[PDB]
Design an enzyme around this catalytic site. Structure first.
Site, PDB file in Angstrom:
ATOM      1  N   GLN A 105       0.823  -1.195   0.000  1.00 30.68           N
ATOM      2  CA  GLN A 105       0.000   0.000   0.000  1.00 30.68           C
ATOM      3  C   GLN A 105       0.860   1.248   0.000  1.00 30.68           C
ATOM      4  O   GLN A 105       0.451   2.278  -0.511  1.00 30.68           O
ATOM      5  CB  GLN A 105      -0.959   0.008   1.180  1.00 30.68           C
ATOM      6  N   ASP A 108       2.227   1.527  -3.693  1.00 30.45           N
ATOM      7  CA  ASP A 108       1.083   1.911  -4.506  1.00 30.45           C
ATOM      8  C   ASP A 108       0.823   3.396  -4.378  1.00 30.45           C
ATOM      9  O   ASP A 108       0.744   4.109  -5.372  1.00 30.45           O
ATOM     10  CB  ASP A 108      -0.149   1.136  -4.034  1.00 30.45           C
ATOM     11  N   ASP A 110       2.681   5.648  -3.560  1.00 37.34           N
ATOM     12  CA  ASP A 110       3.799   6.411  -4.095  1.00 37.34           C
ATOM     13  C   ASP A 110       3.740   6.496  -5.617  1.00 37.34           C
ATOM     14  O   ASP A 110       4.285   7.423  -6.215  1.00 37.34           O
ATOM     15  CB  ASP A 110       5.113   5.758  -3.661  1.00 37.34           C
ATOM     16  N   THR A 184       3.649  11.486  -8.467  1.00 36.44           N
ATOM     17  CA  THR A 184       4.742  11.241  -9.401  1.00 36.44           C
ATOM     18  C   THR A 184       4.925   9.751  -9.653  1.00 36.44           C
ATOM     19  O   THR A 184       4.920   8.959  -8.715  1.00 36.44           O
ATOM     20  CB  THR A 184       6.058  11.797  -8.868  1.00 36.44           C
ATOM     21  N   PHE A 186       7.466   8.038 -10.397  1.00 33.47           N
ATOM     22  CA  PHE A 186       8.696   7.470  -9.879  1.00 33.47           C
ATOM     23  C   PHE A 186       8.501   6.983  -8.456  1.00 33.47           C
ATOM     24  O   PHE A 186       7.608   7.449  -7.754  1.00 33.47           O
ATOM     25  CB  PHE A 186       9.809   8.513  -9.967  1.00 33.47           C
ATOM     26  N   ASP A 188       9.710   7.665  -5.580  1.00 38.43           N
ATOM     27  CA  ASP A 188      10.500   8.795  -5.109  1.00 38.43           C
ATOM     28  C   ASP A 188      10.110   9.338  -3.730  1.00 38.43           C
ATOM     29  O   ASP A 188      10.497  10.453  -3.375  1.00 38.43           O
ATOM     30  CB  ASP A 188      10.441   9.927  -6.146  1.00 38.43           C
ATOM     31  N   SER A 190       7.089  10.220  -2.715  1.00 33.20           N
ATOM     32  CA  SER A 190       6.067  11.261  -2.855  1.00 33.20           C
ATOM     33  C   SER A 190       5.090  11.248  -1.696  1.00 33.20           C
ATOM     34  O   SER A 190       4.547  12.286  -1.343  1.00 33.20           O
ATOM     35  CB  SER A 190       5.261  11.096  -4.146  1.00 33.20           C
ATOM     36  N   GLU A 258      -6.094   6.360   6.062  1.00 29.69           N
ATOM     37  CA  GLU A 258      -7.170   5.487   5.607  1.00 29.69           C
ATOM     38  C   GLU A 258      -7.329   4.253   6.495  1.00 29.69           C
ATOM     39  O   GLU A 258      -8.425   3.708   6.613  1.00 29.69           O
ATOM     40  CB  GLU A 258      -6.938   5.086   4.150  1.00 29.69           C
ATOM     41  N   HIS A 351      -5.771  -6.031  -2.071  1.00 30.71           N
ATOM     42  CA  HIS A 351      -7.035  -5.942  -1.334  1.00 30.71           C
ATOM     43  C   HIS A 351      -7.515  -7.315  -0.877  1.00 30.71           C
ATOM     44  O   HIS A 351      -8.345  -7.432   0.025  1.00 30.71           O
ATOM     45  CB  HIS A 351      -8.107  -5.250  -2.171  1.00 30.71           C
TER      46      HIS A 351
END
Ligand code: HEM
Ligand SMILES: *[C@@H]1O[C@H](CO)[C@@H](O[C@@H]2O[C@H](CO)[C@@H](O[C@@H]3O[C@H](CO)[C@@H](O)[C@H](O)[C@@H]3O)[C@H](O)[C@H]2NC(C)=O)[C@H](O)[C@H]1NC(C)=O
Ligand SMILES: *[C@@H]1O[C@H](CO)[C@@H](O[C@@H]2O[C@H](CO)[C@@H](O)[C@H](O)[C@H]2NC(C)=O)[C@H](O)[C@H]1NC(C)=O
Ligand SMILES: *[C@@H]1O[C@H](CO)[C@@H](O[C@@H]2O[C@H](CO)[C@@H](O)[C@H](O)[C@H]2NC(C)=O)[C@H](O)[C@H]1NC(C)=O
Ligand SMILES: *[C@@H]1O[C@H](CO)[C@@H](O)[C@H](O)[C@H]1NC(C)=O
Ligand SMILES: [Ca+2]
Length: 595
Positions: A105, A108, A110, A184, A186, A188, A190, A258, A351
């Site tokens: 997760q 994902d 990211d 993004t 990548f 990276d 994010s 979440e 999931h």
């Protein structure tokens, strides 16, 4: 061959070309095509989109229309007949820890994010979708079939809103609808730092020139940090317990709260940044705040790449790993690093890896309190259980000691997600993640199961026997054709996940291809990949090879006993060792000197 320079992203980001750092937005990675892999742009298409009217209208929208001469079955009915089960007994993964699900997760989040369009300042439409189940514009409700237990308690449908699309984010015209990716492409980090320059700045601690990220000022964890509270009202996290008044955490990704365990790892990563920065300050006293931020951001980005490609992916793809993701041979700038639309549904294999309970364990790895084991549905948008009920230590211990759910063709998604999902906008614990996924497949204009089978160089079943051979299950194949009437119309999500798992992996042949193609592309097409010469020095890379998720826990929690291989099933006390047996990240090669 029409409007190719369309969209509505960030109007201004010019390339430094000689900067040793990534951009927050993801621009300037590819020098020839600056916007390749950047945020707020259309998801890549590997096959042409498939819509009812060939442009924007999903399959299932209109009653009279068919897909290949057949009606598409209601998503909730596909869910009720195929995806659900009652017996949680004997569904755990005997060789995968709960972290295996949890890191999926993280990666994902990211790589992809298609946001919903629910947006008007104040609106009559939000109401029109939820109260009256009226299909129109961005409202695409998930109807309940005959004899659904949810007709008696929840109404006639589940509200569902179509994802944003490119160009005029508001309304439409020619080409097919392309959906946006708000992060993004990548790997990276994010999710820690943001994908917008606006948000990326708000998360930073600019009060001091120490390069740290902002932390919570109202709550602490035995002297360790939490992400700051997101103070936008209304808050989904406050709603679930109005007595507690504990809002959602604020990270780079908007989904960070979440579930309790997702917020747990977001906290570990946020902590690691500051731990790296304070270390880099000791070694380099002359470094200003910006370099401390960027240099730590770069290290943590590599961390996520090393853990993903060395430790996680091999145990997902198994024997298919080497076929799709061969040894690294350097940066190829002709490679499209963009996340495809289908990857966003392929990755949703996880999931089915989500179990029905989350445990909190104590310092001896035994149940922590009278309410140690909690139902997953009670834990959506739950920050109060972290802050007001023991910190993240008993949650992290659970990740290491408990098992993930194994995929079964008879036992696909847990009821905690399939009947009792909570969503941030609404008020009931009554949504269906499986039904949402299938409706989203159609919303996004996915080609059917056989189109992807052909794309991956695999057989395309047309008959029951042909599908029985592929799925290696007579009942499942019969149950799918009873609803879908043909293997051509089977939604990619349900089709991919129904295939038996490959050897030593956790996805089937089709998914292994789809996932394998993508991860290869984002690695080969990233200029700032950790192994690309010139991104890190040689001595720096020799340090980064010794990182592990075990070490992340050791440096950032007060947990002292961890396993050496954290992604597999471990038992206490045998498989667990003191933190001193785990290799540290040596930051010596980051020390730079004037002369
Ligand atoms: C309890 C934990 C989790 C919860 C509550 C959760 C919930 C959600 C929700 C509500 C969505 C939005 C679906 C949509 O609107 O299309 C979503 C998307 C998604 N999920 Fe999860 N999820 C969890 C864990 C995971 C894990 C472990 C993985 C992978 C291992 C994963 C993979 C994905 C992917 C790839 C998307 C689509 C991302 C995009 O492209 O926008 N999720 N999840
Ligand atoms: C941004 O960074 C600054 C500077 O690093 C942070 O200010 C510092 O906050 C810490 C933690 O709250 C304070 O340390 C505290 O020290 C006292 C005395 O040692 C102790 O009793 C507390 O338990 C805690 O350890 C410290 O007062 C403060 N230092 C400075 C230079 O003002 C700030 O929290 C960060 N801001 C954000 C939004 O993250
Ligand atoms: C659980 O599965 C993992 C994943 O394959 C196994 O770990 C492998 O261990 C062998 C050494 O015996 C290595 O050569 C492989 O490289 C490992 N696999 C990978 C790719 O990580 C492990 O054997 C299993 N553990 C138990 C106790 O059953
Ligand atoms: C809402 O959150 C509160 C915490 O703020 C929970 O109440 C606490 O529960 C534990 C165990 O019963 C006690 O040790 C605390 O004293 C309680 N706090 C107070 C002041 O009430 C409560 O259980 C939550 N409610 C629901 C329904 O989830
Ligand atoms: C780069 O990738 C492209 C597209 O897959 C491929 O054709 C080419 O051989 C690669 N270039 C080099 C020199 O590796
Ligand atoms: Ca990213």
């Amino acid at each position: 061959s029409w409007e190719v320079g369309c969209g509505a992203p960030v109007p201004l980001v010019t390339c430094d070309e000689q900067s040793p750092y990534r951009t927050i937005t993801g621009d300037c990675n590819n020098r020839r095509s600056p916007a390749l892999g950047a945020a707020n742009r259309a998801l890549a298409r590997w096959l042409p989109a498939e819509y009812e009217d060939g442009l924007a209208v999903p399959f299932g929208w209109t009653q009279r229309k068919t897909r290949n001469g057949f009606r598409v079955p209601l998503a909730r009915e596909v869910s009720n007949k195929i995806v659900g089960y009652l017996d949680e007994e004997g569904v755990l993964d005997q060789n995968r820890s709960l972290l295996f699900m949890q890191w999926g997760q993280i990666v994902d989040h990211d790589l992809d994010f298609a946001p919903e369009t629910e947006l008007g300042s104040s609106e009559h439409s939000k109401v029109q979708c939820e109260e009256y189940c009226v299909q129109g514009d961005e409202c695409f409700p998930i109807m309940f079939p005959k004899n659904d237990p949810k007709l008696k308690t929840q109404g006639k449908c589940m509200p569902f809103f179509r994802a944003g699309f490119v160009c005029p984010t508001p309304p439409y015209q020619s080409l097919a609808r392309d959906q946006i990716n708000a992060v993004t492409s990548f790997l990276d980090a994010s999710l820690v730092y943001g994908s917008e320059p606006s948000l990326a700045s708000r998360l930073r601690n600019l009060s001091s020139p120490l390069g740290l990220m902002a932390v919570n000022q109202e709550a602490w964890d035995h002297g360790l940090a939490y992400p700051p509270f997101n103070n936008v009202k209304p808050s989904p996290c406050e709603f679930i317990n109005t007595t507690a008044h504990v809002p959602c955490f604020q990270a780079g990704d908007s989904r960070a709260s979440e579930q309790i365990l997702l917020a747990t790892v977001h906290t570990l990563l946020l902590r690691e940044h500051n731990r790296l920065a304070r270390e880099l300050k000791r070694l380099n006293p002359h470094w200003d705040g910006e370099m401390l931020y960027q240099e730590a951001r770069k290290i943590l980005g590599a961390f996520i790449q090393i853990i993903t490609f060395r430790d996680y992916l091999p145990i997902v793809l198994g024997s298919e790993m080497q076929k799709w993701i061969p040894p690294y041979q350097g940066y190829n700038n002709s490679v499209d690093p963009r996340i495809s639309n289908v990857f966003t549904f392929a990755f949703r294999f996880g999931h089915m890896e989500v179990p029905s309970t989350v445990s909190r364990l104590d310092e001896n790895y035994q149940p922590w309190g009278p309410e140690a084991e909690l139902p997953l549905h009670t834990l959506f948008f739950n920050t109060w259980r972290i802050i007001k009920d023991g910190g993240i230590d008993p949650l992290v211990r659970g990740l290491l000691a408990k098992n993930s759910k194994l995929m079964n063709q008879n036992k696909m998604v847990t009821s905690e997600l399939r009947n009792k999902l909570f969503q941030p906008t609404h008020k009931v614990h009554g949504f269906d993640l499986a039904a949402i996924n299938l409706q989203r497949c159609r919303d996004h204009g996915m080609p059917g199961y056989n189109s992807w089978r052909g794309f991956c160089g695999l057989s395309q079943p047309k008959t029951l026997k042909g599908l029985q051979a592929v799925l290696k299950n007579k009942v499942l194949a019969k149950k799918l054709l009873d609803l879908y009437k043909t293997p051509d119309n089977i939604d990619i999500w349900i089709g991919g996940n129904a295939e038996p798992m490959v050897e030593r992996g956790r996805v089937g042949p089709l998914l292994a291809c789809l996932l394998g193609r993508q991860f290869q592309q984002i690695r080969d097409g990233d200029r700032f990949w950790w192994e690309n010469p010139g991104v890190f020095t040689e001595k720096q890379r020799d340090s980064l090879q010794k990182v592990s998720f075990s070490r992340l826990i050791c440096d950032n929690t007060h947990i002292t006993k961890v396993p050496l291989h954290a992604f597999q099933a471990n038992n206490y006390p045998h498989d667990f060792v003191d933190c001193s047996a785990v290799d540290k990240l040596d930051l010596s090669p980051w020390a730079s000197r004037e002369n």
